[PDB]
Design a protein around this nucleic acid. Sequence first.
RNA 1: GCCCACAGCCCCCGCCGCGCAGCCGAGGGCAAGGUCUGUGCCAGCAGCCGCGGUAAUUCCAGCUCGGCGAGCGUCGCGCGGCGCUGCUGCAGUUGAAACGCCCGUAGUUGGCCCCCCGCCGCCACGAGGAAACGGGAGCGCUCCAGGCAGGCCCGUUGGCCCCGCCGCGUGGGACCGCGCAGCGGGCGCGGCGCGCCGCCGCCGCAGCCCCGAGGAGAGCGGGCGGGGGCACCGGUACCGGCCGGGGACGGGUGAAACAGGAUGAUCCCGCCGAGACCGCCGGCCGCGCAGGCGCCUGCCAAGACCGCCUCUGUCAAUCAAGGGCGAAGGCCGGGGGCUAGAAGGCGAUCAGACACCACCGUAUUCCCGGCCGUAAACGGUGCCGCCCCGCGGCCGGCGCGCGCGUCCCGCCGGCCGCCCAGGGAAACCGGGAGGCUCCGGGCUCUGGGGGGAGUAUGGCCGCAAGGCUGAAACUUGAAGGCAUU
Lengths: 150, 139, 77, 79, 25, 129
Amino acid sequence: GRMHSKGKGISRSAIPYTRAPAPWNKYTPEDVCEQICKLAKKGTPPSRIGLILRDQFAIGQVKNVTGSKIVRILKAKGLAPEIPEDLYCMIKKAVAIRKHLERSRRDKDSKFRLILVESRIHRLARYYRQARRLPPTFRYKSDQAAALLA
Amino acid sequence: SKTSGLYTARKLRTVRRVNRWADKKYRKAHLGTWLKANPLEGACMARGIVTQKIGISAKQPNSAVRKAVRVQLTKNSKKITAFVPRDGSITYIDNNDEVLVAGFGRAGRAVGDIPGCRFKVIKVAGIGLLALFLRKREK
Amino acid sequence: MQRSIIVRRDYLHFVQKYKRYERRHKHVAAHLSPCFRVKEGDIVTIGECRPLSKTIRFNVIKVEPVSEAAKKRFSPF
Amino acid sequence: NVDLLYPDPVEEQRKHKLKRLVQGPNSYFLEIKCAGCQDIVVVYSHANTPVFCPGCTSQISIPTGGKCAFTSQVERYRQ
Amino acid sequence: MRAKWAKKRMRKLKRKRRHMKARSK
Amino acid sequence: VRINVLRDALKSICNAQRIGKKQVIVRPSSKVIIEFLQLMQKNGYISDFAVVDNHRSNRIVVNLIGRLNKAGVISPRFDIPANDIEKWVVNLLPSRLFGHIILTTSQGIMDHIEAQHRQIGGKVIGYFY
RNA sequence: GCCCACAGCCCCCGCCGCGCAGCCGAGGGCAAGGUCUGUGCCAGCAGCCGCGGUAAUUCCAGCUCGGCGAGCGUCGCGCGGCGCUGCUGCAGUUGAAACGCCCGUAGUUGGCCCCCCGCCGCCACGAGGAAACGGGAGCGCUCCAGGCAGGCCCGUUGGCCCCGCCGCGUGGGACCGCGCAGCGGGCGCGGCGCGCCGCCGCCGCAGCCCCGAGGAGAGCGGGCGGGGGCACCGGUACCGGCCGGGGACGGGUGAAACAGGAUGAUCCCGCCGAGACCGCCGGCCGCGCAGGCGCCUGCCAAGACCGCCUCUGUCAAUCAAGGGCGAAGGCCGGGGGCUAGAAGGCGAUCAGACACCACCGUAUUCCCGGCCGUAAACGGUGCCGCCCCGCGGCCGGCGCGCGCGUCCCGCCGGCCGCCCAGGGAAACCGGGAGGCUCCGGGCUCUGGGGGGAGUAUGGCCGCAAGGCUGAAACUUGAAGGCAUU
């Protein structure tokens, strides 16, 4: 179930059993990688670029066609985001919750949400540091979070 | 409950050590607060000089005047009230006679109708009280 | 410490009544030779030596480096 | 004669995709035709993100909870 | 509510007992 | 979370056999699970088993003949000296003569009698009677 | 005689030769009179249940009988009984007991995956080091507790096992965790042969990514909800005022009585002021981490769920300490002030009433900043995980199908009712309190007969009120649960 919520919901994408380029596929692996870089230049978060390739184009799974996941392709060209996107999205959510709370000190429920989002940021950050994706130097500073977004 | 894991022995050892104290039986046996409280002070018998004699009304429903001698133990100068067993055997006891008093039998609990009395007289003036009742020996 | 390290060595102690074990850790002082450079968490092969001080009876014989952050990780090697 | 390891596909698709014998994708790829062009734009059935017709610079898909609705003149031509 | 009224009497005695302790502190 | 996958498996196997259902389905496929099933097939307790692949955990469908009394796991896996497979049989098996206790040993996953022949012991994986 | 430092004891012989039982009980538990005396709730007995108050199966004695036996009874304690300490192996809805809630580190626990190597446990077998002891080979101390004996005898014997030795050796390496680096070749035996270490594209190497959890996190879209804050803001009612009206009561109640009426009340109608409060719709509706949550128009961040061929790749679980939240009442500074209303005052009642019912009324209720830290905070049921038998309702999201409609059928997440199995001491649970004496998924919390006592004292916390932690001495044979009559 959800770490900070009591919901037991299971909405999960299930990838196809046969990992193959679509029968209707007409594009090379490099062609997809060159397209991916253009969206990376646009700055689109990696989850979004996968959605765009699936909906705007028709590559259902990048691994099936290119042979690599989108983040691995970004890392190869050095077009990877410095913070793994998953941490960035929580950090951005925490920044907004902090801003709303600064206007209202009476929103006790909002403070509750801030503790959980910040706790998730700290938990995920430790994993990234251990993996070496992020530096041992990384520490979460609420004060520097907005600056960290850039 | 029952946390079980290959490396969880310490938690189980601590739980047993802390929880074992809860039973009145482990505490009375091992806390040892009772040893200090025990007039007998960890002995089966104690020698004390009779300082008083009295009749204690038996707890209702049973009714009688149980015959007892209040004795201060020689060992700790600690007061004890001791029942005299057998029929009319308080006649054998005399004030200042010196008696050996042994546990009534419930390990520090009052036994039977006698109220709040935990000790019984087994010897009077060097002669067994039962033997005095059975006429084996005289005075 | 000055040219010294407190090597922590982990180990398991088995209790028979509860067939479960208890992870037990001990701290031992060791002399660090300047020839070696160690950061906390590194594995050091201490070798027994003459009682060199009040607490130092072991001296580092070899060091293998470890990463900055890879978790404390109970290791009874 | 009920046999597991050999299930009936029309009945099996009712099962949650993950609770099926092999975790499968319910979603598929249609091949929608353009508003006037004979070109076929292949569209993922579940498209939360907007898609557009080739050449014709206008919306082709309405995002929904499930299967996307189609905004312009469309021929489903499902694949 | 005898349990409630019993804890009110205990609380009263505990107030008086602490106050008396303070006089002789 | 899901920790001992074997407990899940055996609980579903015993439950399905209790209602009689001929086929039972186990969500996660494991080497230890397959080996317990292979030991059950060797003693005939399970009629047949097959693993459907999902490119994930892998799923297992077990054909039950209807002859299984109970199958359980022991957690944590306790190391058993070859001397103690005497005592464990007494408290975990129905009778000294019949019933099987299965222990993982360096030689492999084997029944109590097989490891008694080899005079070796390992950690209990579980018990099938 | 034999034995002995010397006796003696044993044993061997002659000669005499003289067997000798207690202690606790007989109502049960507990084996053994429902005997015969005394006695009369006295005296006593009785571990416990109890017995005795005139027909004592229980005392005190004879009588018989029973147990055990040269011993038997009592007391204190250990162990066993007691699965009443529980690892095996306890219990926590109601018997004692799930922290009020969420976050949370230490701790503990972690899905699936690579065979074939290195460390760790791990199992086996060694070695090494004390015997006695305890086993255990053999041996008739006349038996036996014993002891190492013995007998023309394995070089007569006196074997052998047993220091978890938390080490060491060796093998297995299933299970169990962990292992970031390019490799191969050539100088190079780079100074008796390797290893270094450099340096050659040096051309040999598929050089180099398991997978995508009916784990978790991030995303996108689609709707959903009395979820939160902040302003704005309607509506009537209660209450107070005011103008006109019309004329004797009005309130109140179970009856009353007090306070209100010609200073015109009650009552009617307009009008204003003030503060609360969201009616009927409003619930087997929903949202929320609980506590809780319902006027209008906004405004601001959220949240679960569903849908998905989106991204990440174990990032997880449960949790000492630590942090936040927490109905009401209370408090402390500021407001505000209708109503209701602890205190307080009155008026009936009653023996009393000082309580219930009426009347008036302060703190409070309301707001803002703090404090408090508790509730029958309950669903009296911790959390994550799996299996789980059908039948109904309801809420949200989605899908399939057709006349087609807020239809039909599912799926997922909830909120519920009834139950078959199963379970339980039952009441009852059954989406668990099932899958559990055939007992072991993980992790925290608490309980261990009733009082004493949540007291004393010590600590901390609080402005206090108090909270949190927390006894013992001592007392007692019951307390409790659920059902039946």
